[PDB]
Amino acid sequence: IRREAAQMQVEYQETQQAHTQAQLELLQRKFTNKALYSWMRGKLSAIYY
Amino acid sequence: LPRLVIWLYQVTQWLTEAEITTEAIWLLCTPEFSGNISPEISNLLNNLR
Amino acid sequence: QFFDLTQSFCLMAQEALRRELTDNGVTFIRGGAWNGTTAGLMAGETLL
Amino acid sequence: PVMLERTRNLVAQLTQFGTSLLSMAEHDDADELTTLLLQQGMELATQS
């Protein structure tokens, strides 16, 4: 019975690993992602110059 | 030959210390390039003209 | 829709300057104010 | 000079619209992360 609980803990850690993978992908497919911010202040910096 | 061996040891130890993968260090330093105008370059030129 | 109207105002403003200086060669609205890399944002700042 | 004044008022309004669009997208995407976190917490809670 203890072995079953320990094995289920492994599944718990694997799920947490997949959860952070989904979070990171959601940040990259975001509309206000890194690329949008990078190009916006790049355009505005040239205009400000 | 010992110079090559010591060079290989220094680089591999450095990569592990700095947490840089073998693929990552290759992409940073290789002279081989695709030769195709990537969309990143195309977007750079279109905003630059 | 607002960008379409705004750039139209800029163009006829440029034509007024061409008439006053009698220089048809001057160009200030060069296109590309609306760029796909920024989803259309930073368009008004370019026109300013 | 008159055409420049009328155009400049419209362009300033266009900038205001762009600022609102970026601000709203930031808030909406923040809620997207929070919603995902709650759904993931539920799945973890079931295993617990």
mmCIF file of C-alpha atoms in Angstrom:
data_model
loop_
_atom_site.group_PDB
_atom_site.id
_atom_site.type_symbol
_atom_site.label_atom_id
_atom_site.label_comp_id
_atom_site.label_asym_id
_atom_site.label_seq_id
_atom_site.Cartn_x
_atom_site.Cartn_y
_atom_site.Cartn_z
ATOM 1 C CA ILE A 1 0.000 0.000 0.000
ATOM 2 C CA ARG A 2 2.898 2.351 0.768
ATOM 3 C CA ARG A 3 4.454 1.459 -2.594
ATOM 4 C CA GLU A 4 1.246 2.493 -4.363
ATOM 5 C CA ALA A 5 1.299 5.867 -2.592
ATOM 6 C CA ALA A 6 4.961 6.398 -3.505
ATOM 7 C CA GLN A 7 4.250 5.550 -7.153
ATOM 8 C CA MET A 8 1.330 8.005 -7.178
ATOM 9 C CA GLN A 9 3.725 10.668 -5.913
ATOM 10 C CA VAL A 10 5.840 10.079 -9.029
ATOM 11 C CA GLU A 11 2.734 10.687 -11.146
ATOM 12 C CA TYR A 12 2.120 13.850 -9.110
ATOM 13 C CA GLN A 13 5.610 15.165 -9.906
ATOM 14 C CA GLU A 14 5.240 14.261 -13.590
ATOM 15 C CA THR A 15 1.957 16.184 -13.753
ATOM 16 C CA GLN A 16 3.625 19.221 -12.166
ATOM 17 C CA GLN A 17 6.356 19.039 -14.812
ATOM 18 C CA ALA A 18 3.724 19.047 -17.566
ATOM 19 C CA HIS A 19 1.929 21.940 -15.852
ATOM 20 C CA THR A 20 4.975 24.219 -16.043
ATOM 21 C CA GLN A 21 5.450 23.195 -19.681
ATOM 22 C CA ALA A 22 1.911 24.363 -20.475
ATOM 23 C CA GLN A 23 2.468 27.639 -18.612
ATOM 24 C CA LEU A 24 5.652 28.376 -20.562
ATOM 25 C CA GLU A 25 3.986 27.640 -23.904
ATOM 26 C CA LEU A 26 1.033 29.873 -22.981
ATOM 27 C CA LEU A 27 3.491 32.701 -22.285
ATOM 28 C CA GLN A 28 4.995 32.248 -25.761
ATOM 29 C CA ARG A 29 1.662 32.101 -27.634
ATOM 30 C CA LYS A 30 0.468 35.159 -25.687
ATOM 31 C CA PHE A 31 -0.486 38.205 -27.730
ATOM 32 C CA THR A 32 1.710 40.379 -25.490
ATOM 33 C CA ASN A 33 4.621 37.965 -25.761
ATOM 34 C CA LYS A 34 8.337 38.792 -25.858
ATOM 35 C CA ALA A 35 8.351 39.480 -29.607
ATOM 36 C CA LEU A 36 5.544 42.048 -29.400
ATOM 37 C CA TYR A 37 7.242 43.945 -26.573
ATOM 38 C CA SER A 38 10.658 43.816 -28.256
ATOM 39 C CA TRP A 39 9.410 45.291 -31.539
ATOM 40 C CA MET A 40 7.233 47.942 -29.870
ATOM 41 C CA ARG A 41 9.965 49.619 -27.824
ATOM 42 C CA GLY A 42 12.328 49.145 -30.760
ATOM 43 C CA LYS A 43 10.019 51.168 -32.998
ATOM 44 C CA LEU A 44 9.405 53.743 -30.266
ATOM 45 C CA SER A 45 13.117 54.060 -29.457
ATOM 46 C CA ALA A 46 13.861 54.954 -33.082
ATOM 47 C CA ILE A 47 11.007 57.479 -33.067
ATOM 48 C CA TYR A 48 12.234 58.916 -29.759
ATOM 49 C CA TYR A 49 15.734 59.228 -31.235
ATOM 50 C CA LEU B 1 47.440 14.973 -28.567
ATOM 51 C CA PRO B 2 47.601 15.812 -24.816
ATOM 52 C CA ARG B 3 46.762 19.417 -25.732
ATOM 53 C CA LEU B 4 43.604 18.211 -27.484
ATOM 54 C CA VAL B 5 42.681 16.058 -24.480
ATOM 55 C CA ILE B 6 43.141 18.903 -22.000
ATOM 56 C CA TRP B 7 41.214 21.267 -24.292
ATOM 57 C CA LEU B 8 38.296 18.822 -24.426
ATOM 58 C CA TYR B 9 38.309 18.492 -20.631
ATOM 59 C CA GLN B 10 38.338 22.257 -20.030
ATOM 60 C CA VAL B 11 35.469 22.966 -22.438
ATOM 61 C CA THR B 12 33.210 20.140 -21.236
ATOM 62 C CA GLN B 13 33.754 21.098 -17.590
ATOM 63 C CA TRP B 14 32.996 24.732 -18.445
ATOM 64 C CA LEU B 15 29.795 23.784 -20.280
ATOM 65 C CA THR B 16 28.556 21.777 -17.289
ATOM 66 C CA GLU B 17 29.450 24.605 -14.889
ATOM 67 C CA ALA B 18 27.729 27.251 -17.038
ATOM 68 C CA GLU B 19 24.755 24.970 -17.868
ATOM 69 C CA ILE B 20 25.261 25.254 -21.634
ATOM 70 C CA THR B 21 24.260 22.292 -23.779
ATOM 71 C CA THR B 22 26.374 20.936 -26.623
ATOM 72 C CA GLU B 23 23.810 22.149 -29.163
ATOM 73 C CA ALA B 24 23.733 25.604 -27.551
ATOM 74 C CA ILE B 25 27.496 26.145 -27.742
ATOM 75 C CA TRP B 26 27.460 24.966 -31.365
ATOM 76 C CA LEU B 27 24.756 27.473 -32.337
ATOM 77 C CA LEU B 28 26.745 30.260 -30.658
ATOM 78 C CA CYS B 29 30.061 29.670 -32.446
ATOM 79 C CA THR B 30 29.625 27.673 -35.668
ATOM 80 C CA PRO B 31 30.364 29.436 -38.979
ATOM 81 C CA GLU B 32 27.840 27.217 -40.782
ATOM 82 C CA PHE B 33 24.640 29.093 -41.613
ATOM 83 C CA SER B 34 21.457 28.282 -43.501
ATOM 84 C CA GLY B 35 21.954 30.835 -46.269
ATOM 85 C CA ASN B 36 18.213 31.592 -46.404
ATOM 86 C CA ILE B 37 16.639 34.969 -45.643
ATOM 87 C CA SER B 38 14.785 34.029 -42.465
ATOM 88 C CA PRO B 39 11.510 35.745 -41.490
ATOM 89 C CA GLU B 40 13.376 37.487 -38.660
ATOM 90 C CA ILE B 41 15.692 39.085 -41.227
ATOM 91 C CA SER B 42 12.810 39.854 -43.599
ATOM 92 C CA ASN B 43 10.895 41.634 -40.828
ATOM 93 C CA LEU B 44 14.072 43.513 -39.894
ATOM 94 C CA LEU B 45 14.558 44.772 -43.458
ATOM 95 C CA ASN B 46 10.902 45.745 -43.941
ATOM 96 C CA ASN B 47 10.865 47.884 -40.790
ATOM 97 C CA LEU B 48 14.315 49.325 -41.579
ATOM 98 C CA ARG B 49 13.835 50.659 -45.119
ATOM 99 C CA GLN C 1 -10.749 51.998 -39.531
ATOM 100 C CA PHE C 2 -9.305 54.953 -37.605
ATOM 101 C CA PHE C 3 -5.830 54.402 -39.064
ATOM 102 C CA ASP C 4 -7.272 54.543 -42.590
ATOM 103 C CA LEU C 5 -8.838 57.943 -41.901
ATOM 104 C CA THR C 6 -5.768 59.199 -40.027
ATOM 105 C CA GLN C 7 -3.306 58.332 -42.803
ATOM 106 C CA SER C 8 -5.685 59.933 -45.310
ATOM 107 C CA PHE C 9 -5.513 63.180 -43.323
ATOM 108 C CA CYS C 10 -1.708 62.939 -43.289
ATOM 109 C CA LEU C 11 -1.578 62.545 -47.076
ATOM 110 C CA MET C 12 -3.642 65.653 -47.842
ATOM 111 C CA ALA C 13 -1.605 67.493 -45.224
ATOM 112 C CA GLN C 14 1.517 66.488 -47.160
ATOM 113 C CA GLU C 15 -0.068 67.704 -50.401
ATOM 114 C CA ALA C 16 -0.709 71.087 -48.774
ATOM 115 C CA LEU C 17 2.990 71.332 -47.907
ATOM 116 C CA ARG C 18 3.912 70.407 -51.487
ATOM 117 C CA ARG C 19 1.694 73.231 -52.750
ATOM 118 C CA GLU C 20 3.153 75.790 -50.335
ATOM 119 C CA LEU C 21 6.790 74.912 -51.071
ATOM 120 C CA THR C 22 6.071 74.185 -54.774
ATOM 121 C CA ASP C 23 8.198 71.038 -54.382
ATOM 122 C CA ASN C 24 6.484 67.839 -55.533
ATOM 123 C CA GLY C 25 9.552 65.750 -54.655
ATOM 124 C CA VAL C 26 9.270 65.972 -50.867
ATOM 125 C CA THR C 27 7.907 62.794 -49.271
ATOM 126 C CA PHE C 28 7.261 62.321 -45.558
ATOM 127 C CA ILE C 29 4.560 59.634 -45.389
ATOM 128 C CA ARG C 30 6.767 56.777 -46.583
ATOM 129 C CA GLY C 31 4.421 53.875 -45.854
ATOM 130 C CA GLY C 32 4.860 51.073 -43.373
ATOM 131 C CA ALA C 33 3.446 53.004 -40.417
ATOM 132 C CA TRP C 34 1.184 49.994 -39.821
ATOM 133 C CA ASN C 35 3.531 47.007 -39.503
ATOM 134 C CA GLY C 36 2.428 43.436 -38.864
ATOM 135 C CA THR C 37 5.218 42.803 -36.353
ATOM 136 C CA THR C 38 3.434 45.084 -33.847
ATOM 137 C CA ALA C 39 -0.165 44.136 -34.792
ATOM 138 C CA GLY C 40 -0.715 47.709 -35.980
ATOM 139 C CA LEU C 41 0.396 49.385 -32.754
ATOM 140 C CA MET C 42 2.968 52.200 -32.828
ATOM 141 C CA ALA C 43 1.253 53.536 -35.949
ATOM 142 C CA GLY C 44 0.214 56.908 -34.538
ATOM 143 C CA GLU C 45 3.693 57.544 -33.139
ATOM 144 C CA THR C 46 5.236 57.018 -36.583
ATOM 145 C CA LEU C 47 2.737 59.432 -38.143
ATOM 146 C CA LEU C 48 3.460 62.004 -35.425
ATOM 147 C CA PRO D 1 -0.979 75.084 -40.867
ATOM 148 C CA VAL D 2 -4.719 74.425 -40.504
ATOM 149 C CA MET D 3 -4.493 70.985 -42.147
ATOM 150 C CA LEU D 4 -1.590 70.099 -39.851
ATOM 151 C CA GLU D 5 -3.636 71.054 -36.777
ATOM 152 C CA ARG D 6 -6.643 68.941 -37.782
ATOM 153 C CA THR D 7 -4.459 65.957 -38.686
ATOM 154 C CA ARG D 8 -2.449 66.200 -35.461
ATOM 155 C CA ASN D 9 -5.611 66.004 -33.338
ATOM 156 C CA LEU D 10 -6.690 62.803 -35.102
ATOM 157 C CA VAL D 11 -3.247 61.190 -34.788
ATOM 158 C CA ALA D 12 -3.167 61.952 -31.059
ATOM 159 C CA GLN D 13 -6.538 60.216 -30.681
ATOM 160 C CA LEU D 14 -5.171 57.221 -32.607
ATOM 161 C CA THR D 15 -2.312 56.940 -30.099
ATOM 162 C CA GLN D 16 -4.850 56.925 -27.255
ATOM 163 C CA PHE D 17 -6.664 53.973 -28.843
ATOM 164 C CA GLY D 18 -3.417 52.020 -29.170
ATOM 165 C CA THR D 19 -2.578 52.593 -25.509
ATOM 166 C CA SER D 20 -5.959 51.191 -24.443
ATOM 167 C CA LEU D 21 -5.537 48.161 -26.714
ATOM 168 C CA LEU D 22 -2.167 47.252 -25.191
ATOM 169 C CA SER D 23 -3.384 47.789 -21.621
ATOM 170 C CA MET D 24 -6.449 45.572 -22.132
ATOM 171 C CA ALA D 25 -4.416 42.799 -23.733
ATOM 172 C CA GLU D 26 -2.066 42.854 -20.737
ATOM 173 C CA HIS D 27 -4.951 42.448 -18.281
ATOM 174 C CA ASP D 28 -6.722 39.805 -20.380
ATOM 175 C CA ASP D 29 -3.558 37.722 -20.741
ATOM 176 C CA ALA D 30 -2.934 38.003 -16.995
ATOM 177 C CA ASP D 31 -6.342 36.413 -16.371
ATOM 178 C CA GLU D 32 -5.469 33.658 -18.861
ATOM 179 C CA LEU D 33 -2.512 32.623 -16.697
ATOM 180 C CA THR D 34 -4.630 32.727 -13.527
ATOM 181 C CA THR D 35 -7.338 30.558 -15.105
ATOM 182 C CA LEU D 36 -4.750 27.978 -16.188
ATOM 183 C CA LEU D 37 -3.236 27.928 -12.690
ATOM 184 C CA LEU D 38 -6.606 27.191 -11.069
ATOM 185 C CA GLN D 39 -7.370 24.372 -13.520
ATOM 186 C CA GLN D 40 -3.954 22.811 -12.899
ATOM 187 C CA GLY D 41 -4.452 23.155 -9.146
ATOM 188 C CA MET D 42 -7.695 21.177 -9.399
ATOM 189 C CA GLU D 43 -6.023 18.285 -11.203
ATOM 190 C CA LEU D 44 -3.277 18.220 -8.566
ATOM 191 C CA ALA D 45 -5.903 18.374 -5.805
ATOM 192 C CA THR D 46 -7.634 15.264 -7.169
ATOM 193 C CA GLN D 47 -4.385 13.286 -7.017
ATOM 194 C CA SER D 48 -3.722 14.582 -3.495
#
